[PDB]
Amino acid sequence: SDGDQCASSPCQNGGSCKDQLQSYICFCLPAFEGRNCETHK
């Protein structure tokens, strides 16, 4: 049920990729931060 956003690794820094109802939220690691790890600490 709903699972396409993470079809091309829309996240960065090996961040995770979750699928929501509006789009998707990646779960970066303690090393980075942001919906796409775009904020690498």
From Swiss-Prot:
The chain holds residues 105 to 145 of 466 of the full protein. This is Factor VII light chain. Residues 2-38 form the EGF-like domain. Changing residue 35 to Q: In FA7D; Charlotte. It comes from Homo sapiens. The modification (3R)-3-hydroxyaspartate is found at residue 19. The gene is F7. The record marks 9 as: Important for S-112 for O-xylosylation. Glycans are attached at residues 8, 16. Disulfide bonds join 6-17, 11-26, 28-37.
